[PDB]
Design a protein around this ligand. Sequence first.
Ligand SMILES: O=C(N[C@@H]1CN(C(=O)c2cccn3cncc23)CC[C@H]1c1ccccc1)c1ccc[nH]1
Ligand SMILES: O=C(N[C@@H]1CN(C(=O)c2cccn3cncc23)CC[C@H]1c1ccccc1)c1ccc[nH]1
Lengths: 301, 301
Amino acid sequence: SGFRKMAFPSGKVEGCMVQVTCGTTTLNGLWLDDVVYCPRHVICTSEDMLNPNYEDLLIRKSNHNFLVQAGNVQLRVIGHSMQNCVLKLKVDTANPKTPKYKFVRIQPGQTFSVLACYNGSPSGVYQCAMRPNFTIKGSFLNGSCGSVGFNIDYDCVSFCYMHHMELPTGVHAGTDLEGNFYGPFVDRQTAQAAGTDTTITVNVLAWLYAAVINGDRWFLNRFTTTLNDFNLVAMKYNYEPLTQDHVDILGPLSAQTGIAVLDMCASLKELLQNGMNGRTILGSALLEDEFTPFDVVRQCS
Amino acid sequence: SGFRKMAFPSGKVEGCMVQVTCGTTTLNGLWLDDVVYCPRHVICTSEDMLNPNYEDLLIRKSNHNFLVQAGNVQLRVIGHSMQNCVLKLKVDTANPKTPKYKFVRIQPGQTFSVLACYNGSPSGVYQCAMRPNFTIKGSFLNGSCGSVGFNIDYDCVSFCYMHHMELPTGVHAGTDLEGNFYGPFVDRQTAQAAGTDTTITVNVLAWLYAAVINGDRWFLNRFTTTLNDFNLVAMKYNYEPLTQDHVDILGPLSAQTGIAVLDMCASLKELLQNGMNGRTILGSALLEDEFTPFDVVRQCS
Ligand SMILES: O=C(N[C@@H]1CN(C(=O)c2cccn3cncc23)CC[C@H]1c1ccccc1)c1ccc[nH]1
Ligand SMILES: O=C(N[C@@H]1CN(C(=O)c2cccn3cncc23)CC[C@H]1c1ccccc1)c1ccc[nH]1
């Protein structure tokens, strides 16, 4: 028993982290096989940053402008290329610690582990979610660009996030590992801001199932709701719409606990309308939305 | 910016986890050099468990009763010994992945990362604290005994916890790596329960400093308190006494933010007496006590 915010074991990703240096600018890169992947803004000066043309900036670089350090070993760059917002540096040595891996672009609502890194060196691991507004609420300082987010599927690391920037509200924006931003953001200094976020309803429902599995049952009731009447309440409280696909995904947890999805929806409706009244669920005094249905199943059973 | 519950990168500990089997009983062990460390209750049957004499139970075992598996490789046990509540199995192979390491027995209030394991295989990583009552609020299922808790100091892993049991309330009890329980607990099935816990005051104050560093400042006030008058309030709300040593430890954070420790104590006093009034701090609607002063410094700067 017990329920914690739990990251994946980070070892397999630790063995891929490198430092990439271009000039005075230094950040982290991901070394898989003979390629190192990093944010393309490593090639920029402060003057460039207002509106860079990256195609011009990279045209003016040679392989010898890129210093890659793996540990204490300097890796020699033998080719360079840009794919979207990521730079790919080909190196002369394949990483002997390369795990089995995939690159995946995730949907909003999906969770992942972040290995926060500075100068090629892992500092900490944490879980977060891709928010509906395509930011993440991470924990990142100066120097952390190029840190990655991942899930593990047995022995396969599925990389899903590379960190690029911090927005004015203190949340974070970045790309998939093929260099496409999540959201409307661009890799320049401009006026960009996060849009209005929503709560991830299917995840709240999953975590209420986690709570039941762990013995918190106070919020349950004898009532049910229709999906439409639930969705009407959800809209009012700035929650995402619940779909039949979500209802179907919550199937396993419904079966384990004995509580129908739309019966759990009536609990959530009551919690939204009334509050908790000073009580807690799983240690929380607010409704938590960064555990997926899969995360609950993973951890609880 | 941002502030998350953050574990240490777990790689160095992942390379030490093994499965230990004794009969039908299987659990996790920690392989460092040529020794594997695990909970001594691996030698018990269900019948024994009411009140085992472990000295008799181990006297009846040979080396060949212990199967250690590292990955797919079976490691051959060449000696066995008991130290307190841990079994030490000497194996014929030194672990080539052994990190630099220490064993440390921590004080209540200190935090650590847990690598939760099943059958020798890491499943997830999370942070927790040693509570004042000498339990931890972990996340552990059947099969997780022998999972360890640790801190990292540069490249040195300081192991501080080995998991042994779950108490009736769903919290967890275990030992240091020399096999001494934290708390009054014993490794048998008996009527034992967690005592009344308290909130770790110095850690709450650290996290309020984290909040200020990250821009949440709403809870601050123009007031101050004496240490004695603060301690009087702390007692009433079931908080641990704040010492001058704690005040001194909070020095760095006081200096960075400009807020005196006893001025921050007046904020906490006001929060205890009045509540948050529907506001949040760092995403939380309750006061968080599982970040130490060191953890804040680590993460924020
Ligand atoms: O995020 C911005 N700038 C970053 C700042 N930075 C950091 O490593 C960093 C600093 C401070 C907190 N952090 C948290 N994560 C990373 C950082 C170096 C890269 C730079 C950048 C360059 C080209 C394109 C995109 C971002 C920025 C500017 C205006 C709004 N945002
Ligand atoms: O924790 C108890 N028994 C454990 C149960 N167990 C597990 O791996 C485990 C099961 C279920 C949830 N978990 C969470 N962490 C581990 C587990 C095998 C070892 C056993 C044990 C044997 C000798 C001495 C101490 C504990 C127990 C009994 C009465 C109160 N507590």
